[PDB]
Paper text:
The strict glycopeptide-preferring enzyme TxgGalNAc-T3 then adds GalNAc to acceptor Thr one position N-terminal to existing Thr-O-GalNAcs and is predicted to sequentially O-glycosylate Thr rich repeats within the mucin domain of CST1. The structures reveal a unique GalNAc binding pocket that dictates the substrate preference of TxgGalNAc-T3, which is coupled to a 2nd metal binding site that is strictly conserved among apicomplexan homologs.
To investigate the basis of the substrate specificity and function of TxgGalNAc-T3, we solved the x-ray co-crystal structures of TxgGalNAc-T3 in complex with Mn2+, a non-hydrolysable form of UDP-GalNAc (UDP-2-(acetylamino)−4-F-D-galactosamine disodium salt, UDP-GalNAc-F) and each of the following glycopeptides: CST1.4, Muc5AC-3,13, Muc5AC-3, Muc5AC-13, and SRS13.2 from 2.2-2.9 Å resolution. We modeled UDP into the active site but did not include GalNAc-F due to weak electron density, either due to the high mobility of the GalNAc moiety or hydrolysis of UDP-GalNAc-F during crystallization. For the mono-glycopeptides, we observe density for Thr-O-GalNAc in the TxgGalNAc-T3:Muc5AC-3 co-crystal structure, but disconnected and weak density for the peptide residues. Overall, the lack of density for the peptide backbone or Thr-O-GalNAc at the C-terminal ends of the glycopeptides suggests a lack of strong interactions with the catalytic or lectin domain of TxgGalNAc-T3. Thr-O-GalNAc at the +1 position on the glycopeptides is bound to a pocket in TxgGalNAc-T3 consisting of His333 (catalytic domain) and Glu554 (lectin domain) that interact with GalNAc via sidechain H-bonds, and Ser334 (catalytic domain), which interacts with GalNAc through a mainchain H-bond. We observed density that appears to be a 2nd metal (Mn2+N) near the GalNAc binding pocket, a striking and unexpected feature not previously seen in metazoan GalNAc-Ts.
Author numbering:
A (entry chain B): 102 to 318, 322 to 628
B (entry chain A): 103 to 318, 321 to 418, 426 to 628
Amino acid sequence: LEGAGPGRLHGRLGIKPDGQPGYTRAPSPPTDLSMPQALARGGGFNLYLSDHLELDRTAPDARHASCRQLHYDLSTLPKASVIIVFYNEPFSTLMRSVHSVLNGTPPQILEELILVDDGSTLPYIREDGNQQLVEYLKLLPAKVRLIRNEVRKGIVGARMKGIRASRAPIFAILDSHIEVSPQWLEPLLLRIKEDSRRVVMPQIDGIDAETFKHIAGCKLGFLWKLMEHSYEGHQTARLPPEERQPSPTDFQTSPAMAGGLFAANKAFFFDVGAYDEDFQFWGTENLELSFRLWQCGGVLECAPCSRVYHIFRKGGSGYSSPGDSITINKMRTMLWMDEYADLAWRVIGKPRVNYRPESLEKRREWRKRKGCKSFRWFMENVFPEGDVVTLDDVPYLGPLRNDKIGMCLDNMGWASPGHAVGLEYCHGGDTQTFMFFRKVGHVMPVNDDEACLQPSGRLDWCRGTAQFWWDFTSSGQLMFRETKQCLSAFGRKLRMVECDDTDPYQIWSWTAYNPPDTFTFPSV
Amino acid sequence: EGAGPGRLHGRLGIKPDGQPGYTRAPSPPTDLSMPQALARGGGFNLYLSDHLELDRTAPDARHASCRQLHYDLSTLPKASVIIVFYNEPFSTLMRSVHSVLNGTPPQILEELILVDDGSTLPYIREDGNQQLVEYLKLLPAKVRLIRNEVRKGIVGARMKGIRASRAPIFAILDSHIEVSPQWLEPLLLRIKEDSRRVVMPQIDGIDAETFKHIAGGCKLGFLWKLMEHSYEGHQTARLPPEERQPSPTDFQTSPAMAGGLFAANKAFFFDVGAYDEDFQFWGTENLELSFRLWQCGGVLECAPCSRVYHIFRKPGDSITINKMRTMLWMDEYADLAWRVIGKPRVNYRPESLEKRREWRKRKGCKSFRWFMENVFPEGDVVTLDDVPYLGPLRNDKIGMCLDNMGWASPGHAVGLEYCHGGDTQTFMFFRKVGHVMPVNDDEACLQPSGRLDWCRGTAQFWWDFTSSGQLMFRETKQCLSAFGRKLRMVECDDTDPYQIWSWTAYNPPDTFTFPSV
Ligand SMILES: O=c1ccn([C@@H]2O[C@H](COP(=O)(O)OP(=O)(O)O)[C@@H](O)[C@H]2O)c(=O)[nH]1
Ligand SMILES: O=c1ccn([C@@H]2O[C@H](COP(=O)(O)OP(=O)(O)O)[C@@H](O)[C@H]2O)c(=O)[nH]1
Ligand SMILES: [Mn+2]
Ligand SMILES: [Mn+2]
Ligand SMILES: [Mn+2]
Ligand SMILES: [Mn+2]
């Protein structure tokens, strides 16, 4: 288009022949607006507001002041195809994303913008509907090209379609509800140019769901629930001294990624394994990629100078996925965890589903023909700062039983942090199973490695502090280091008392965790 | 203690002197009024129960083929029978305990837990005549009484028993029941082979007035009023051919449960969520468990060889709440269930309900769509596309809507009234059976006579809503007309404005958003 300049590097977007925008902008949201139910009608974010906000919405520059003091030679960088996959995404969010990309990315480095309709059922995105999307696209450069799936395949399914259709040496995947900051793609391209084996991910800022205000705020690990988790304080303390507070312009390696939003050399991406194409809908596809990448000769970095705003959803869901899809994706990811899969399996509930075993083994066959390294290696070199680097760091996993009263601890059915622990009759169920992390002395319910027992008799969010460090003595006591008192089950009440090996009420029996050397997947 | 067949636990309830510790009452009076006696007894004739023996033999209701089975008692897991009760009469409560001990081998019965849910009767009291507490001393040690300081409800009372149970398996029973031979043996074997199975005995009946033993429908669905309903005729026909006439000895799956008489592995039960302990007093806890059980990796089966007789009898806010909480497990279908029970707006404890929404997602429980397509695919509404119309049936010519006239119960006539946009003027359509029904009662069906009647899945209730807007009845090929504020059938003709109706389309959201408080 024409009108090129700073702020609209691809020209004035969204103008018809007449010269007036082809987007009917909405008036200010109502005064009599109920916010808690609007975040459901909008599918996670306030849509009355997004519809009233302009598609060419300026956004503050969130990169560090030192990041702006850089220079990139556009003529010497490879072009890249940005891929935006979307399903039933509202018009305002989807176009504001495309606008933000086209407005803030030089055309010299943007080969194309591929939009992937993953079987949307909205009338504006359907080819048997009002045709608002397709019609409006003619008002965008040819770079922007829409492609569809006749049926919803999921993130993995839709993302491969975009990458497979991409034409550039590099692709950059983005969400359909995003806004970028200046020079967001330039750092990624330069980094992948010098080593095609690097998968680089931008730092993700936020667009508030309710207010749409721009909110600011690199190393990311994982939880044994098979969820991404940001490096905590005690984990950043285990870092090498010179990497504990890296500079704002440095590329920092990350054990894991936050799911989507990354750039990668297309050829390499297909040679390090693309995406397990049996992963369904939403799920843990971000870890299988993270684990697989590192073990098979790749690098995962984050560029603090490449920042992108993202609408994290709140009090609502944008789409509906089946209940089994999440467990399947986790089971398949456990293939890359080797012996540690035994623990991951118990945290997610020792589940047994149809994880498509036939195709999962062919990935194991692929894994061995590629010579990919082990997860123990991964844990010892890529994520050595984790609380569980070896399965010896989980010495006890099982019921915490007091023989005197003949009972064991019980989460009372809610393993989520915040509620109180009670004494009940032992039935050997997951509700009465507890594991121990010796690196931080955390006593946690098996089904949630974020909940930690405290002297108060209740669970709370696990922090690697003196407020959660427990000691399991040789006598069998649960001693709390800070106060140096031991936990007693006297009268079916949880109390702290002077430690004393003669008090049978404070002697506990905790099963030892001596799992196998190799995890054998379940049956179907 | 004198043990043998018929009294597998020995002679129960005898004092040291050698005389029963229960004074039987004489035959009920001849000048007895049944309606007044069935009131003092609380549902069942208590004058008779008091005169009936606690060691009352009962006919074996099991199929003759069920008796040709063999169980090795030494290889079966012990089970804790839990009987919860509130203000249950002595005779009925004890005849049950006697029947259990009399018809259950001691090797497989770890204990029998009696749960007093805050009874206020003098015989059940720590400050009363102490009839129950004393008489229990004359029963084996297996029998253990425990109480709740205040009436907590079924959910509250049953959990107290399950938590107090010490056996790998528990069996929940009513306080007014009598068992058949080998009632517990089939259940234990089934749960031993797969701890994920929740097995239910088939329920026979004890008449309330005469106390006759009555023979007893193993497949159970549900209504959009959130009530269990036994598979109707047209529903059993949608079953696969190999399950339309199941054998008397085969275990048959049931989408839902009809009251809380079931056995389950204790560990499994607590991992499948157990019972929403925010459910209050009596209510629909049987469906919330059923939906949750199936979606979270469990099975609900019925054992036709395990039979139990049950004496069927003859606050209000708790019930609406329990239904709201159950709708959490229905996903988008809650929109339909919500309008059928009257768009209620109450304090459903929206806080603790979210902990279930997280609990459900942390467990990876499947969707209600899955449930309806795999567990209850024989239902009349498998998808919300099976309910295409929901709204007033309006005739623009006379400017009126249909009206249930304030009753909605089957049997009453439909009249024509002026549209006010209320629930009494709302009607939904089930396309699998062509039922025109009032929204507040999916058991009432429009008929050509101009009246509602019990919905039966027959050609006698199948309506067709044409593209022109007519209500055509398939059997007679006649259309409904509102000529003269009267409902009558006329030869169909799209040019007649009196037989053209406007019915709102039902295109609900993709996810149900609960109301506020
Ligand atoms: O079956 C699906 C599910 C999601 N998405 C899209 O994938 C992108 C990433 O998912 P999402 O943003 O919902 O994940 P989040 O980052 O919010 O956790 C979004 O544009 C979704 O609309 C898709 O195309 N198909
Ligand atoms: O607040 C209550 C109400 C009832 N029950 C007992 O729970 C059992 C099942 O209740 P209900 O009488 O409704 O059984 P149904 O008659 O529906 O089979 C009976 O033994 C009741 O006495 C109880 O423990 N607490
Ligand atoms: Mn997103
Ligand atoms: Mn943390
Ligand atoms: Mn009953
Ligand atoms: Mn019926």
